[PDB]
């Protein structure tokens, strides 16, 4: 129990929140005929709410005294899916985007009028460069070793 927290599946306030949300959704359904489309939409909403609460219960989250999930970002292995894995994925994607942009900027620097290639993009060259960023960590690290990453 990190920081005095409790698992979601044992939390009574979590169940009370679920019951309140479902009861609020159900009071609107009594205003419509069961065959009507709004009744179908409300049924789908209720099912989705139940599924969301069940999924939050399954993943091993931690609740406070208010029955709301809390995130642990200290690096504990039991909660790596909360912060670590999405962080690594985001870092990979952002590095991809930055590397592709830098490669395109370097590619057109030697032209007669490099400015005109920035307002009117050269589509084939960018398309050829787009795929190359999939391996950006290796290329960036090898460029850092060779000393070509930093301008002299």
């Amino acid at each position: 129990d990190i920081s005095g927290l409790t698992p979601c599946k044992d939390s009574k306030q979590f169940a009370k929140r679920e019951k309140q949300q479902i009861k609020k959704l159900e009071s609107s359904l009594k205003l419509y005929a069961p065959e009507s489309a709004p009744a179908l939409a409300l049924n789908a909403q209720i099912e989705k709410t139940k599924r969301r609460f069940d999924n939050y219960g399954k993943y091993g989250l931690l609740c406070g005294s208010d029955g709301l999930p809390h995130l642990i970002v200290n690096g504990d292995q039991r909660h790596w899916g909360e912060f670590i894995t999405p962080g690594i994925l985001f870092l990979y994607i952002a590095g991809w985007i930055g590397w592709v942009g830098r490669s395109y900027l370097i590619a057109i620097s030697g032209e007669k009028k490099p400015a005109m290639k920035e307002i009117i993009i050269d589509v084939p060259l960018a398309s050829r460069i787009i795929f190359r960023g999939f391996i950006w960590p290796v290329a960036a690290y090898r460029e850092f070793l060779n000393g070509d990453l930093i301008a002299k």
Binding site: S28, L31, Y32, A33, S36, P38, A41, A44, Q45, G101, R102, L105, I106, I108, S109, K113, P114, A115, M116, E118, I119, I120, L149, I150, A151
Partner: protein, 737 residues
């Protein structure tokens, strides 16, 4: 007079941005080029100096505007046919809230599809289209679908006309300068014939269908509109005078048409709106008047007036040559005409906003409070913006098209030779009004805080009665039978006749009393309007020269300053006077709409019981609480904002989100208004340094925004945030209650 194929239709110019300007076509050395591209896009005068080319360009863009408007109307009509509860609302207008928009369930946003009645879930609309369609006799969705299709076809036609009249047959300059023919056609044909056609539609369609609806008939059991035309027996049953045909019209026996052409006045008790027979008679008379008025100006047949001849004959001992020379100025300058038309259109919009609330023209509109409030506020804002644009383009004309060597006019010359007296007098009037209007509120606040309520300007201690407006109200209330014998009731219920109209347990309209608070708020309105007129007129009158900068006309219309000399010259151009008057227009319109909202919720709107006792929304606290600033802060802003701050978790949560978003946008504008360019240009230099280090420096050198661009961004964000905040507050408050 046209030219055959003046400009080739090609995609070549699409690939060369800035082709309209020599400077912009060179290329983007810095990022200022991109901003310069958009600011000068529609300034056709700077592109070319030929008046014929400018006229040809102007004529074609209005076709695109008409096409966009037709597309918007087509969308509005289509959404009512497919995604609305109009047919359910038509059977019970008083218990069902109109709705014409639905939302896809994606990220939990389906909560916005709250209930509105009639087995429908969607967003409640406040544009008033349902009442417009009901007053036209529309019953089913097939008619709305047909109207949407027709509007789409008309949009396509407008687009084709816009292409044609620029690329295939462009009219010559002599065609544009025919003002007599244009005035004759726009008076007799555009307005008179349109009014006559609408009167015919109201006579043959709206009256019988609306009579059937008011009688209580199921909308699906009402005969179709064409059945009233092919079967004259039905109309004869509804109106016996239709059995005589058009014979009374041609024999001058017009009194026989009194059944469907009345002069009643007041409101219809069943629906709470104006009688439709009065509207039909009004449109008929207006059509006649406009048809007669369109035969005044001379054309190819010698009979009529010459506008130049009329202008040249109006001169006096105080004005010298008078209006001589004004005909040549108004036929060679597009900016002066634009300024005049903008001012007139803004004034007309404000008049329309004032008139539609006191004489509700649509059925079941007075008892729909949200629609009334929304329409009033919308049209007030539109009128204010147009009025400011008028002064902007007047200043543009003064800077550019003023040339006394070939376009001399004595009236304009005499105004420029005593501008100091005008500006000084307006300054004194503004100071006097500000002291004697806002000072009375501070006196009240101090006296209330000190514990001396008997020394306040109020209805109980020191009365300031608006006796001039009360006299007008009394005169208008007693008009029928004395000065308007042909009328049965007064023009409006607000004059003070004493009668009350209630529709479905709600109050539609009733007399509006005037007291001490109205005096103060009206003088506040006068003060704000006078200050705005000061800033705009000073800006127009000193556009060319002053004692500070004699050569101001050589620097242009839109320049930032003339340096730190002469003690400092920031904001001397005419553009800066529009920039400063936008803030005062915002202030004035905000005060006006707050006055309208509080007065309506306090003294007019409410519910009526079986015994005949009225309970207003706020309980009539306007008279005693609005005489202090603390009252406005507490009983208006604090109390009525509880609806918008408690909207989370319900169908009104979008307004709650927009409240905070608009707060953020308003606060974000102060960064651009309080700071200057040099700091941001110095800061960018350090950021560019690290981009050079990693070889990611762009070839288009980054630049800070110009002085004018920063001013424009600040004012735009300031207005957007403020208006959006007020919009969300009003809608969230009025939909709930």
């Amino acid at each position: 007079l046209v030219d055959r194929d003046p400009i080739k239709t090609s995609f070549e110019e699409w690939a060369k941005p800035g082709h309209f300007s020599r400077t912009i076509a060179k290329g983007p050395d810095t990022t200022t080029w991109i901003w310069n591209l958009h600011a000068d896009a529609h300034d056709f005068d700077s592109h070319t100096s030929d008046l014929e080319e400018i006229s040809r360009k102007v004529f074609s863009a209005h076709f695109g505007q008409l096409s966009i408007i037709f597309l918007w109307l087509s969308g509005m009509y289509f959404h009512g046919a497919r995604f609305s509860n109009y047919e359910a609302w038509l059977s019970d207008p008083t218990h069902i809230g109109p709705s014409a928009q639905v939302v896809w369930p994606i990220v939990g946003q389906e909560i916005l599809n709250g209930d509105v009645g009639g087995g429908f879930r969607g967003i409640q609309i406040t544009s008033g289209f349902f009442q417009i369609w009901r007053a036209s006799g529309i019953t089913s969705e097939l008619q709305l679908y047909c109207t949407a299709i027709g509007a789409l076809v008309f949009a396509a036609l407008m687009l084709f006309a816009g292409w044609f009249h620029y690329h295939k047959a462009a009219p010559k300059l002599a065609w544009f300068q025919d003002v007599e023919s244009m005035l004759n056609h726009h008076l007799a044909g555009l307005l008179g014939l349109g009014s006559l056609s609408w009167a015919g539609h109201q006579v043959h369609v709206s009256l019988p269908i609306n009579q059937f609806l008011n009688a209580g008939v199921d909308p699906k059991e009402i005969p179709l509109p064409h059945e009233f035309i092919l079967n004259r027996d039905l109309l004869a049953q509804l109106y016996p005078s239709f059995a005589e045909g058009a014979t009374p019209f041609f024999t001058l026996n017009w009194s026989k048409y009194s059944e469907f052409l009345t002069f009643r006045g007041g409101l219809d008790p069943v629906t709470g709106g104006l009688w439709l027979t009065d509207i039909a008679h009004h449109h008929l008379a207006i059509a006649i008047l406009f048809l007669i008025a369109g035969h005044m100006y001379r054309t190819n047949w010698g009979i009529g007036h010459g506008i130049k001849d009329i202008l040249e004959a109006h001169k006096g001992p105080f004005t010298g040559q008078g209006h001589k020379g004004l005909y040549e100025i108004l036929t060679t300058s597009w900016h002066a005409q634009l300024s005049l038309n903008l001012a007139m259109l803004g004034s007309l919009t404000i008049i329309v906003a004032h008139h539609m609330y006191s004489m509700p023209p649509y059925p079941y509109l007075a008892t729909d409070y949200a629609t009334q409030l929304s329409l009033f506020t919308h049209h007030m804002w539109i009128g204010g913006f147009l009025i400011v644009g008028a002064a902007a383009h007047a200043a543009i004309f003064m800077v550019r098209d003023y040339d006394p060597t070939n376009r001399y006019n004595d009236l304009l010359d005499r105004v420029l030779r005593h501008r100091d007296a005008i500006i000084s007098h307006l300054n004194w009037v503004c100071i006097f009004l500000g002291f004697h209007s806002f000072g009375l509120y501070i006196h009240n606040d101090t006296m209330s805080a000190l514990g001396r309520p008997q020394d306040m300007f109020s209805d109980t201690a020191i009365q300031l009665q608006p006796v001039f407006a009360q006299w007008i109200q009394n005169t208008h209330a007693l008009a029928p039978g004395v000065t308007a014998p042909g009328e049965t009731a007064s023009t409006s219920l607000t004059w003070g006749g004493g009668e009350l109209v209630a529709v479905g347990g709600k109050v539609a309209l009733l007399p509006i009393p005037l007291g001490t608070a109205d005096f103060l708020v009206h003088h506040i309105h006068a003060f704000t309007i006078h200050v705005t007129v000061l800033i705009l007129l000073k800006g127009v009158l000193f556009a060319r020269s002053s004692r500070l900068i004699p050569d101001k006309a050589n620097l242009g219309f839109r320049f930032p300053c003339d340096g730190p000399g002469r003690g400092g010259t920031c904001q001397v151009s005419a553009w800066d006077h529009v920039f400063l008057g936008l803030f005062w227009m915002y202030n004035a319109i905000s005060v006006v709409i707050f006055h309208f909202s509080w007065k309506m919720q306090s003294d007019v709107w409410g519910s009526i019981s079986d015994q005949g006792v009225v309970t207003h929304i706020t309980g009539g606290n306007f008279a005693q609480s609005s005489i202090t600033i603390n009252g406005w802060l507490r009983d208006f802003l604090w109390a009525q904002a509880s609806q918008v701050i408690q909207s989370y978790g319900s169908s009104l949560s979008a307004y709650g989100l927009f409240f905070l978003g608009a707060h953020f946008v308003w606060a974000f504008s102060l960064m651009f208004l309080f700071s200057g360019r040099g700091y941001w240009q110095e800061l960018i230099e350090s950021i560019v340094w690290a981009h050079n280090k990693l070889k990611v420096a762009p070839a288009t050198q980054p630049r800070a925004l110009s002085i004018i661009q920063g001013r424009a961004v600040g004012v735009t964000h300031y207005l957007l945030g403020g208006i959006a905040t007020t919009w969300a507050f009003f809608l969230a408050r009025i939909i709930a209650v």
